[PDB]
């Protein structure tokens, strides 16, 4: 119990380097939906609600890719979309012409059928990036309430708690992220099993219910599936993503390192001051998943449970102490007595409502930014967290190689934007905990 081991915990040290860049599968805060009230049929109906399509042009090139290939891929997309327009029976998904641009982007010249003695390349520093403000903005927006509902009230005693939480989260942007991920991962999987040898065009779609109750169908952009041959569950299918955004890539080019960004149209918006014209961009990039990653993505709903459970137990940490059940007290008014943020004014608190959403966002970003860096940090930072809590209450944790623990943690801090955030977060926690 003899406590005397101090403000020994120091801040974690984060990498120097170029700023970290976006690496989620789809866009997050920068996403743009075209919406209305068979995916391809709905895709076209959604695109028809836009009347600013123009000649696509590159505005932010991919420093490592063949950019005209990106431009051509989009043009090909439009072209093939025209072919489908009208007709009579519009297909699901649709197979695309195996053109030069698509072969290239979908890594088809890396196809084993091609090469020589060079077929003997056997080699055996993953490059540090600094934290950037963008990932925190990302998370902020993730905790926000939306003007739409993304989930039914269930899964289409303490069951009362389920309801309270669901009431507080169904309109959360994090929840949209969940559903966006379920739909397009499911979609990508089917296409991957039902084609294998086809370059499929997959609309990125989600559904929601407005405030006024109308059912809405959203189009985020397109994904083109590459060759998907192999039953290896960890084997990867290459795809290229094509996502609509109002976000100018040039404000934070660093965020978009993996992207070619086209300008694909201009949009006329209603505004506090009238009609304003804003460029519409297409964010393009190559990528890949596996049956396993698609499976995990199809199950992001788990974030709701995990998120909930924490909020649940968090009530026991008060209900057993106050003798009476406290779900109603909390959810019906006050106890905005949990810290959840910093501001210019400093420390800041929020109610179980905000908390519900914040924990949802956290669970969701864990899933969106899943990485070995993250597995490590979590496991290891939990320990430092335990220790920091003890010392905070004047408790001796014991003879423990703390510096050893720091090594473990800081070696997970290389370049992942999400992990770097959590590190920065801990530092802030660390400053308040041992003021």
């Amino acid at each position: 119990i003899e406590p005397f081991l101090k403000t020994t915990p120091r801040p974690l040290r984060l990498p120097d380097g170029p700023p970290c860049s976006q690496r989620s599968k789809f866009l997050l805060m920068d996403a743009l939906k075209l919406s209305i009230e068979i995916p391809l049929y709905d895709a076209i109906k959604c695109m028809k609600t836009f009347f600013g399509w123009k000649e696509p042009n590159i505005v932010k090139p991919h420093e490592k890719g063949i950019n005209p290939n990106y431009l051509l891929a989009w043009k090909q997309v439009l072209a093939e979309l025209q072919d489908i327009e009208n007709e009579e029976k519009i297909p699901k998904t649709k197979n695309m012409r195996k053109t030069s641009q698509l072969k290239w982007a979908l890594g088809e010249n890396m196809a084993p059928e091609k090469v020589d003695f060079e077929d003997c390349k056997d080699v055996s520093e993953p490059k540090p990036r600094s934290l950037a403000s963008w990932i925190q903005s990302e998370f902020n927006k993730a905790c926000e309430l939306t003007d739409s509902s993304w989930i039914e009230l269930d899964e289409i005693i303490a069951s009362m708690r389920r309801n309270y939480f669901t009431a507080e989260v169904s309109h959360c942007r994090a929840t949209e992220y969940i559903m966006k991920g379920v739909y397009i991962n499911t979609a990508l999987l089917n296409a991957s099993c039902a084609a294998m040898d086809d370059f499929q065009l997959i609309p990125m779609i989600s559904k929601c219910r407005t405030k006024e109750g109308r059912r809405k169908t959203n189009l985020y952009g397109f994904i083109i599936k590459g060759r998907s041959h192999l039953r290896n569950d960890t084997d990867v299918v290459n795809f290229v993503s094509m996502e609509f955004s109002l976000t100018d890539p040039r404000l934070e080019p660093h965020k978009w390192e993996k992207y070619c960004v086209l300008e694909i149209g201009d949009m006329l918006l209603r505004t506090a001051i009238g009609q304003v014209s804003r460029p519409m961009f297409l964010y393009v990039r190559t990528n890949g998943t596996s049956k396993i990653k698609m499976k995990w993505g199809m199950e992001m709903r788990r974030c709701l449970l995990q998120s909930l459970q924490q909020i649940e137990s968090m009530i026991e940490a008060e209900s057993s102490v106050k003798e009476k059940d406290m779900t109603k007290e909390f959810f019906e008014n006050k106890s905005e007595t949990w810290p959840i943020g910093e501001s210019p004014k400093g420390m800041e608190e929020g109610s179980i409502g905000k908390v519900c959403r914040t924990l949802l966002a956290k669970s969701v970003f864990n899933s969106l930014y899943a990485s070995p860096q993250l597995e490590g940090f979590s496991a290891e930072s939990r320990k430092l967290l335990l220790i920091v809590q003890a010392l905070r209450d004047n408790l001796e944790p014991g003879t423990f190689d703390l510096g050893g623990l720091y090594e473990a943690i800081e070696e997970c801090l290389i370049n992942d934007p999400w992990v770097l955030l959590n590190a920065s977060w801990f530092n802030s926690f660390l400053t308040h905990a041992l003021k």
């Binding site: 925190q136 998370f139 902020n140 905790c143 968090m314 940490a317 007595t337 949990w338 810290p339 959840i340 943020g341 910093e342 501001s343 420390m347 800041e348 908390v355 914040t358 924990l359 966002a361 956290k362 939990r382 967290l385 335990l386 809590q389 959590n422 977060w425 801990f426 802030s428 926690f429 308040h432 905990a433």
Partner: peptide, 16 residues
């Protein structure tokens, strides 16, 4: 405006 930080919860909620 508030930058959200879920780790701050642990100023109050005990780890685990």
């Amino acid at each position: 405006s508030m930058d959200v930080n879920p780790t701050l919860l642990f100023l109050k909620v005990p780890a685990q």
